Amino acid sequence: MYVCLCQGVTDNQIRDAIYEGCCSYEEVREATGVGTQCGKCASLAKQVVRETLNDL
Ligand code: FES
């Protein structure tokens, strides 16, 4: 699904950003743009980050 409609970032793209090097929402934000516009998706994006890290 789209986590961030403003930037067109999917849950899979957040996971892949982590697999590819990111360790934090802040890094995923800079790498993908998630949460940089209205910011309403930040909590959901942080949930995806937390879930992905816990699964590693
Ligand atoms: S929905 Fe992600 S910044 Fe607006």
Expressed in Å, this structure's resolution amounts to 1.5
Q: For a ligand 1 pocket test, name from 1, 5, 44 the mutation site with the most ligand atoms within 8 angstroms of its C-beta.
A: 5
Closest atom of ligand 1 to 45 CA is 2
The structure was resolved experimentally with X-ray
Which protein residues are within 6 Å of ligand 1, measured from CB?
A: 4-7, 35, 37-41
Q: 9 is in which domain, residue-wise? A: 1-56
Inter-residue contact 34 to 41 (CB < 8 Å): yes
The total number of structural domains that make up the chain:
1
CA 28 to CA 17: how far, in whole Å? 6
Domain holding 5: CATH number? 1.10.10.1100
CA 32 to CA 52: how far, in whole Å? 16
Contact residues for 53 (Cβ-Cβ < 8 A; gap 6+) = 18, 23
**Which residue, 52, 53, 37, is CA-closest to 4?**
37
Inter-residue contact 45 to 14 (CB < 8 Å): yes
Contact residues for 55 (Cβ-Cβ < 8 A; gap 6+) = none
Contact residues for 11 (Cβ-Cβ < 8 A; gap 6+) = 1, 3, 48
Tokens encoding 12:
């899979």
Inter-residue contact 8 to 2 (CB < 8 Å): yes
Classify burial at 49, counting beta carbons within 10 Å of its beta carbon; exposed 0-12, middle 13-18, buried 19 or more: buried
